[PDB]
Amino acid sequence: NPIDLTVLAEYHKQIESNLQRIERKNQRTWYSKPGERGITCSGRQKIKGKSIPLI
Amino acid sequence: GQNMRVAFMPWNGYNFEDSILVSERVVQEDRFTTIHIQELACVSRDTKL
Structure with a gap:
């Protein structure tokens, strides 16, 4: 009887x-x-810009 | 466009080289107001995760 992990x-x-x-x-x-x-369609995805400060 | 009552005269410099003065009757009768139509789409994407 050795050890067994067949169920694992x-x-x-x-x-x-x-x-x-x-x-x-x-x-x-x-x-x-x-x-x-x-x-039969098109993606049309566009990303605009933002005003991001830099502190 | 639309046709309007126009006088040719120098009026206090507000029409110096090619500028145009407009009285508020043209605004209140809203007779150059313009409708604009924009379009924006949005897609659901099969990324990972």
Whole structure:
């Protein structure tokens, strides 16, 4: 009877597999490719300036 | 534009090289007031974290 952390490896593999499934689904439906027509909108984001003192 | 009553005369220097004097009747009848339309967008971005 030596020491044992097989349940630790199973738990860590379960965490890795569940996180890989969720992140694969999110990176599947957020960086998809639009088809035959192109990007149907535009980003249009612009940043203006401010008056920032320097004390 | 719009058509207005104009006198050609030097009036106290307020029209020195090419300046124009305007009476407040042109303001109160708001007959050069102009509507402007700006546009601003905002996107939700898939960053990390």
